[PDB]
Amino acid sequence: NCTFEYVSNLREFVFKNIDG
Amino acid sequence: ASVYAWNRKRISNCVADYSVLYNSASFSTFKCYGVSPTKLNDLCFTNVYA
């Protein structure tokens, strides 16, 4: 059941989930 | 697929152009219910079943 699929030292990331 | 084993396709996140299908004489039947067949491109829904 897949509803989405996308394909494209210090590293910072911010992950959040707001309003879907 | 057979009519009793009707196949269902799920459509999430993809732009589509229902004008090249509505303008096609190949389709012997194009009838819409609850939504006008002309004004179709403006509508927006979260998911589509085929």
Mutate to test the interface with B, among A3, A6, A7, A19 (most CBs of B within 10 A): A3
Spatial distance between the Cα atoms of B7 and B3, rounded to a whole number of angstroms: 8
Question: Between the CA atoms of A14, A1, B8 and B4, what dihedral angle is there, to the nearest 10 degrees?
Answer: -160
Phi/psi for A3 (5° steps) reads -115, 0
> Distances from the Cα of B19 to the Cαs of A17, B14, B30, in angstroms?
35, 15, 12
Which structural technique was applied?
Answer: cryo-EM
Spatial distance between the Cα atoms of A11 and B20, rounded to a whole number of angstroms: 46
* C-alpha radius of gyration, chain A, whole number: 13
Instruction: Give this entry's resolution in angstroms.
Output: 2.8
Which of chain A's residues have a Cβ under 8 Å away from the Cβ of B12?
Answer: 3-4
In A, minimum Cα distance to B48 occurs at A3
The distance in angstroms from the start CA to the end CA of chain B is 12
What residues does B10 pair with on adjacent strands? B49
